Amino acid sequence: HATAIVTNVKHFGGMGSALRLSEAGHTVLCHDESFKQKKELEAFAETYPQLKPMSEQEPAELIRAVTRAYGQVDVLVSNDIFAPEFRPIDKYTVEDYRGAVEALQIRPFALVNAVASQMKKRKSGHIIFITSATPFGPWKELSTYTSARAGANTLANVLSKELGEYNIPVFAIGPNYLHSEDSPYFYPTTPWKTNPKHIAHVKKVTALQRLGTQKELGELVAFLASGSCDYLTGQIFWLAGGFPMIERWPGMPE
């Protein structure tokens, strides 16, 4: 069976991806910061017997471990996370930007850098970055997070050009307003399904007037990873329910 790595599986698009990839018949190797602790890894493995958590934390280490134990990495889902911190540009430190770039650009780069050679040698593989739709509709005072996510989107697009010759599609999925259940990355049930202000905000700024679901994200990840539509390689997908809705002139209804 085909192998798939999902990183930061407890957060963002991790569970939607891992669960739907597993249902599609992949062996899903799952990374997470919490899996440094045996108790957390074992608890996850018991709750999700169809998933295979690994303890390895860093990119080369993780790729090498999965390759040793399962033969090869057929699918990489780089589910990258970093807390958005809103500040006026002069109130950040430079290290605040470096941290965002490290988590949101250097990390997916390092994973591809470690796995690309084995994919190129057999001329097969799929690479998916989960990034952000914030560059499409940016908020004021989120300059660090948003620009790093744009770097990752362009990284995916550029990589598609060189890896296409080796039959390796590369995609970026950029969500916004994706319900993240009990993860703070980025729309947890509380407040986003519980507080009237937040419920009204989502109804206002998305065309579909709701949060996106983990199932929708997982369906897209599994579809791309299936090899059924490789000709989309290089695509940045905006998975944001039609966000942004743009405020209309006075006198028009919402």
Task: Restricting to residues 152-171, name those near its own copies by CB under 8 A.
Answer: 152-155, 157-165, 167, 169
Q: Among 86, 123, 182, 184, which residue sits at the site for its own copies (rule: CB under 8 A)?
A: 86
- Within a 10 A sphere around the Cβ of 73, how many other Cβ atoms? 23
Question: Alpha carbon 155 to chain centroid distance?
Answer: 14
Q: Which does 55 bind (CB under 5 to 8 A by kind): Cl ion, its own copies, Na ion, none?
A: Na ion
Picked from its own copies, Cl ion, Na ion, none, the partner binding residue 82 (CB below 5 to 8 A depending on kind) is none
Q: Figure out which of the listed residues 73, 103, 148, 225 binds its own copies, where binding follows CB under 8 A.
A: 148
57 binds, among Na ion, Cl ion, its own copies, none (CB under 5 to 8 A by kind): Cl ion
Q: How far is the CB of 55 from Na ion (least distance, A)?
A: 3
- Cβ contacts of 143-149, under 8 Å, gap ≥ 24: 143/89, 143/92, 144/85, 144/92, 144/96, 144/97, 144/99, 144/100, 145/82, 145/84, 145/85, 145/100, 145/104, 147/100, 148/82, 148/97, 148/100, 148/101, 148/103, 148/104, 148/105, 149/104, 149/174
- Omega cis (within 30) before 250: no
Q: For residues 224-253, which are near its own copies according to CB under 8 A?
A: 228-235, 237-242, 244-252
Between 143-163 and 107-122, two packed helices, what is the crossing angle to 10 degrees?
10
Residue 236, CA distances (Å) to 39, 123, 149, 151, 219 in order: 37, 23, 11, 12, 16
User: Residues 190 to 219: which contact Cl ion by CB under 5 A?
Assistant: 213-214
Select 33 or 120, whichever has its Cβ closest to its own copies. Answer: 120
92 binds its own copies (CB under 8 A): yes
Structural tokens at position 143: 């300059």
128's contact among its own copies, Na ion, Cl ion, none, with CB below 5 to 8 A by partner kind, is none
Q: Which of 3, 22, 144, 180 binds its own copies (CB under 8 A)?
A: 144
Q: How far is the CB of 85 from its own copies (least distance, A)?
A: 12
| Residue 226 lies near Na ion (rule: CB under 5 A) | no
> Does 31 participate in binding Cl ion (rule CB under 5 A)?
no
Q: Which of 104, 110, 90 is nearest to 5 (CA)?
A: 110
**Chosen from its own copies, Na ion, Cl ion, none, partner binding at 106 (C-beta under 5 to 8 Å by type):** its own copies
Question: Please, which of residues 126-185 interact with Cl ion by CB under 5 A?
Answer: 175-176, 178-179
The rounded distance, in Å, linking the Cα atoms of 112 and 70 is: 18
Identify what 248 binds: its own copies, Na ion, Cl ion, none; CB under 5 to 8 Å per kind.
its own copies
- Which residues contact Na ion (rule: CB under 5 A)? 55
